[PDB]
């Protein structure tokens, strides 16, 4: 069900992650630091319970969860969320609710690459990963 998506994804293309980060209200130097980072996207499971990491130069998360069950969350912006993540379609879709607000993360193979979509607002992220080794 998952597995396609297990294993090391590093950043290769992004569209629209300014726009994101600022409809989340993330501050304009966090933006710029984010704007030139490439990070690591690590996806583990250990039976049911999925681990999904993400690195880079300027932050660090860590998330596990059990698809289908709610748990919360401190986004790398330090939100704290709810959070659930179920697979839809193929995709891996991560729907974040705080204060009323959502934003959905949706991961999706396309090619061999893991294409990530995040939704906010009105604004539109495109990212893409390809596998590393
Ligand atoms: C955690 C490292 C990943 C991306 C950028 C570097 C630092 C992050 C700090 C602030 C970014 C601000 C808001 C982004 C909001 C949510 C994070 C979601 C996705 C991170 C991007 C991704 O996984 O490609």
Redesign the pocket.
Known sequence: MVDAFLGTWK?VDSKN?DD??KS?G?GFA??Q??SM?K?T?IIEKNGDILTLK???T????EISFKLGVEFDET???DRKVKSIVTLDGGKLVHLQKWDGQETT?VRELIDGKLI?T?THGTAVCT?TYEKEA
């Open positions: 950043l992650f994101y980060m989340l993330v966090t933006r630091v984010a980072t990070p996207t993400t690195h880079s300027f932050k660090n998360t986004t790398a912006d993360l990530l995040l990212r």
